[PDB]
Design a protein around this nucleic acid. Structure first.
Ligand code: DCP
Ligand code: DCP
Ligand code: MG
Ligand code: MG
Ligand code: MG
Ligand code: MG
Lengths: 373, 373
DNA sequence: TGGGGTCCT
DNA sequence: AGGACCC
DNA sequence: TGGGGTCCT
DNA sequence: AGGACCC
């Protein structure tokens, strides 16, 4: 129960793919998906002209005035497609982990070994790779670990062909020995391709990063913190002092991110199953008076109710969130949780009141249904 | 799936019972179990002389200078007996809920109905009660609800006989239609007896209380809050305004405690199963220097390790707690959680360090192992 | 600088 | 409740 | 005023 | 993390 074969599957310009499938006339045209003033993502034709992900409409448009834009505020369709993709990956192997709407990890370890036991003592010399090999590294067919990672590159290719054939979506995959590597290597060949990482090239991959905020797990916060100590490259982090780090982020934050800086990462691929929550969010900077704005709350609920319904499970908690304005508070949402009266659980009318009263004990508003059962 | 038959089982002077079984020479002598300066509980011979639960050693001793005292700081034995009792109740019906070391709720609804279907259309006129009937109320053998509550009083009597015969422990039981009533009525006949609550006497029971802090669920906090509004008796609470209450404790705290004030309570008896946590706590007011005091931390761990071990499940988190001194801060413990390094999970040496470092990011100290799996 | 979503403390 | 991290 | 323990926000 | 509630 030690060496693993994990794949990370990461779809191409996901929202824009889904919009291009819905309206084919958007193909071959540079496309951006807008949400308020933000171009959240764009198709590859777009990125050729300079549009980057999370550009504002303005910069997007003055970098490329020929850009089509469609609204992506409503996530319904993306969320549906997102689950269609996870469910299809669950068929290859039950344990799939989601990350956002367009990433999935799958532990292919049991699958690879079953395939290897089916191959006679002869064809195993014919095992080939599918896709790119990170760093152009040579394969060694007598290396058991190379053989398992190639077999894993083949399962990957089959998952991508099925995603294409069955749902019409393209994507990249990365095959590696842990989740951190598999995700870092799935991006090496961007558009609709896959890459496999052999152990000998782990260090090359991790040292190819230009700053530790590129390591999955180190976010906006730890990043500035690590800086304050002089730690800027992944090597700085590798060689920095455990004690001084240990004692400045807590043994947890520290002992973990240091392992990552080496490419080491033992977290298991967890089963995501159905969501732990369902929320809708509306935005209207400056428009929320602070009484005239409740009707918005009934807006969110209308959809929420129909969604939560469907899954089936009924939520046993509700939550309401906000955010106020003037200077850049960087950080500042407020909320009030509350249990969903048991009668209310088995419709719209009351909810409004819970929320309204929940509203008073209290830029933008949202509603979350959690604690599903 | 509506009317229930629930029993609440509540053992007599639990710690002192266990001490009297271990040292029979303590029988018939007034006994108090001490923890530091507190007489946490005493046997009934004691309470005759004035010793009340949670009296200080002094008041206990000047109220009764003939009082034997044994130390009950180490809970090991009480905890063992506590699980022996729950496991024996689980045999009658799988769903047992614990509350503290000496209370258990059991939903006897399915059991009662199975027994009623086994009784021919004749002996059912002979169904009798076992124990006291709260308020001396008359039974009506044609009342299906009376019949089910009597059958439930019989299951209760059988559980108490088994607790006695199998583990040597006596206790009280209360049979009622929900958890709140079953617990309120289990105390009406204190020492080693049982009482059953028929629906017609619910109001009499609930109005027999002298203040709302006597209702399970209303604690030290809500109590003072309800006061601030004039709400003192259970009737005040019953008749107080939902809105003004709703909006002063939150719709949750309010809509719930108001139901309780009526005797209404729909919470289901939950399965407690194995514990969600294991902790040890040591006390030494004023003795913790704030470096000389870590050895204490290794004390707690020694036992913890052996305990957590046993259950089997390994904890995936550790926690360390404190509390400082001068004026009565009423309220004031501090803690720092931290994940238990995976290598450490499958021994003593490191733990100490996690705790020590956990100790520095930081009257008494403790260690908790949680997040079992 | 959107609209979601997960787990920890 | 709020924080941190991810897409 | 002990030494535990549970669930919520 | 801390709060509230229970034994
Ligand atoms: N901060 C973020 C990150 C992403 N997304 C949405 C828009 C994307 O379509 C989708 C997936 O995130 P990715 O980083 O994968 O972006 P893409 O799939 O769109 O692009 P790529 O093709 O570079 O993987 O999630 C978002 O709304 N907000
Ligand atoms: N604040 C509290 C409450 C109780 N206990 C311990 C000592 C008791 O023996 C046991 C059970 O609590 P009870 O209220 O049931 O007290 P008793 O069983 O001891 O007495 P009774 O016979 O009145 O039920 O838990 C405790 O240590 N601290
Ligand atoms: Mg992605
Ligand atoms: Mg993507
Ligand atoms: Mg009790
Ligand atoms: Mg008791």
């Amino acid at each position: 129960a030690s060496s693993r074969v994990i794949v990370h599957v990461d779809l191409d310009c996901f929202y824009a793919q889904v919009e291009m499938i819905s309206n084919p006339e958007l193909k071959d045209k540079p496309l951006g998906v807008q949400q308020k003033y933000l171009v959240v993502t764009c198709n590859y034709e777009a990125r050729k002209l300079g549009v980057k992900k999370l550009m504002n409409v303005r910069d997007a448009k003055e970098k490329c005035p020929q850009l089509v834009l469609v609204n992506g505020e409503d996530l319904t369709r993306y969320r549906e497609m997102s689950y269609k993709v996870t469910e299809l990956l669950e068929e290859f192997s039950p344990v799939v982990e989601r990350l956002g709407f367009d990433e999935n990890f799958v532990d292919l370890t049991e699958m690879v070994e079953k395939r290897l036991q089916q191959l006679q003592s002869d064809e195993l010399s014919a095992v080939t790779v599918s896709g790119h090999v990170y760093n152009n590294q040579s394969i060694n067919l007598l290396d058991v670990l190379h053989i398992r990672l190639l077999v894993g590159s083949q399962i990957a290719a089959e998952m991508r062909e099925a995603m294409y054939n069955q749902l019409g979506l393209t994507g990249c995959a990365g095959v590696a020995s842990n989740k951190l590597l598999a995700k870092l290597v799935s991006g090496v060949f961007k558009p609709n391709q896959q890459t496999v990482l052999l152990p000998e090239s782990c260090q090359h991959l991790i040292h190819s990063l230009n700053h530790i905020k590129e390591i999955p797990g180190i976010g906006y916060k730890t990043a500035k913190c690590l800086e304050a100590l002089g730690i800027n490259s992944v090597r700085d982090l590798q060689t920095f002092s455990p004690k001084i780090l240990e004692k400045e982020l807590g043994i947890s934050v520290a002992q973990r991110i240091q392992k990552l800086s080496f490419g080491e990462d033992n977290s298991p691929v967890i089963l995501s199953g159905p969501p732990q929550s369902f929320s809708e969010e509306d935005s209207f900077k400056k428009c929320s008076s602070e009484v005239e704005a409740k009707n918005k709350i009934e807006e969110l609920l209308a959809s929420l109710l129909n969604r939560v319904c469907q899954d089936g499970r009924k939520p046993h908690t509700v939550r309401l969130i906000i955010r106020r304005y003037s200077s850049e508070k960087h950080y500042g949402r407020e909320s009030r949780q509350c249990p969903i009266p048991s009668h209310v659980i088995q419709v719209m009318t009351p909810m409004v009141d819970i929320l309204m009263k929940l509203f008073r004990n209290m830029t933008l508003l949202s509603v979350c249904f959690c604690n599903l059962k």
